[PDB]
Amino acid sequence: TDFSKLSKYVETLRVKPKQSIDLKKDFDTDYDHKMLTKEEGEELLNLGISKLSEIQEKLYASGTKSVLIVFQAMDAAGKDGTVKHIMTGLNPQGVKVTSFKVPSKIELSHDYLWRHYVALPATGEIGIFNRSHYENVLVTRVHPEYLLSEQTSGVTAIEQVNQKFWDKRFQQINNFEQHISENGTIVLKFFLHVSKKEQKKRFIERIELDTKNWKFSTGDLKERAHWKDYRNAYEDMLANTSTKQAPWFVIPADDKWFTRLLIAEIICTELEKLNLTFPTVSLEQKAELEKAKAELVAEK
Numbered sequence: 001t002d003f004s005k006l007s008k009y010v011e012t013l014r015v016k017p018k019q020s021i022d023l024k025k026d027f028d029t030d031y032d033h034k035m036l037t038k039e040e041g042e043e044l045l046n047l048g049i050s051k052l053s054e055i056q057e058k059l060y061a062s063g064t065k066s067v068l069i070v071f072q073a074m075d076a077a078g079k080d081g082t083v084k085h086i087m088t089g090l091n092p093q094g095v096k097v098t099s100f101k102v103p104s105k106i107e108l109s110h111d112y113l114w115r116h117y118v119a120l121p122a123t124g125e126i127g128i129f130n131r132s133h134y135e136n137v138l139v140t141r142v143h144p145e146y147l148l149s150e151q152t153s154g155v156t157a158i159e160q161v162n163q164k165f166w167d168k169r170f171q172q173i174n175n176f177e178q179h180i181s182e183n184g185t186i187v188l189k190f191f192l193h194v195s196k197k198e199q200k201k202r203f204i205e206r207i208e209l210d211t212k213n214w215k216f217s218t219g220d221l222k223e224r225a226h227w228k229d230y231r232n233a234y235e236d237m238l239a240n241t242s243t244k245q246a247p248w249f250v251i252p253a254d255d256k257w258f259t260r261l262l263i264a265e266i267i268c269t270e271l272e273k274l275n276l277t278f279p280t281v282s283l284e285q286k287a288e289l290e291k292a293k294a295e296l297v298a299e300k
């Protein structure tokens with residue numbers, strides 16, 4: 001069956017704890033062996049959205065678990081659109097998107113994790129981090145001079161930023177995700193992997209669209225110029241912060257419809273392990289319902 005092939009491919013996208021990461025050689029940004037048509041996919045995507053809505057409903061009705069979903073990617077990989085599409089099928093009462101832009105003055109007066117801890121999802125809720133605490137081992141690692149401006153970093157000279165500084169930050173991130181995992185939070189992390197070539201194409205496509213080129217950030221080019229620096233940061237990060245408890249998935253991003261299918265797919269598959277069920281109606285409650293129905297019928 002097609003889905004059976006998909007479940008098999010999906011597992012190759014999970015980053016294993018001991019796994020070493022080369023984003024250049026491995027992790028195709030576009031899956032050629034695509035096992036279903038773009039049509040099939042948009043229909044399996046619809047099912048994934050409906051199922052996720054069902055899961056979210058059952059999650060909200062129970063008071064047990066929260067769900068944290070992290071999205072990281074290079075500009076133009078499809079992150080905002082994946083978030084928007086995940087959302088279309090969710091109830092806004094039980095889901096919350098936080099887009100972590102550049103930190104505020106207050107947030108800079110706290111450790112780099114503080115503002116993400118503040119924004120964690122409550123029991124029964126889904127939290128989506130569009131950008132996340134991982135920015136602090138990515139953009140900060142490509143631009144290590146930012147750490148000098150961060151009062152809590154304890155970094156005075158760029159000389160002291162080395163692999164051991166990042167190792168300690170991975171440890172801090174891992175202890176943080178482990179703690180919340182041990183206290184009811186399901187953590188799922190997606191890196192949307194777009195090719196340097198496809199980013200180029202999408203950048204140019206936007207520049208040439210009058211309806212949308214007002215949105216183009218030419219500063220995105222400065223980060224594109226640091227492509228190799230970012231791949232290294234992502235590689236070292238994926239190799240050191242994917243656990244079985246809080247796994248990373250590397251999603252091919254060059255085909256948006258397929259990116260969305262996979263992420264919807266993985267979220268459903270992972271949250272189905274919770275074996276969530278709608279609340280059942282006891283005999284006492286069934287009696288109360290029939291009493292209420294009787295009164296409504298017995299109205300003058």
Ligand SMILES: Cc1ccc([C@H](O)P(=O)(O)O)cc1
Pocket residue numbers: 074075076077078079080081202203204206
């Ligand atoms: C060219 C271009 C398209 C879409 C976007 C979105 O903001 P994302 O795919 O980075 O979330 C950014 C740049």
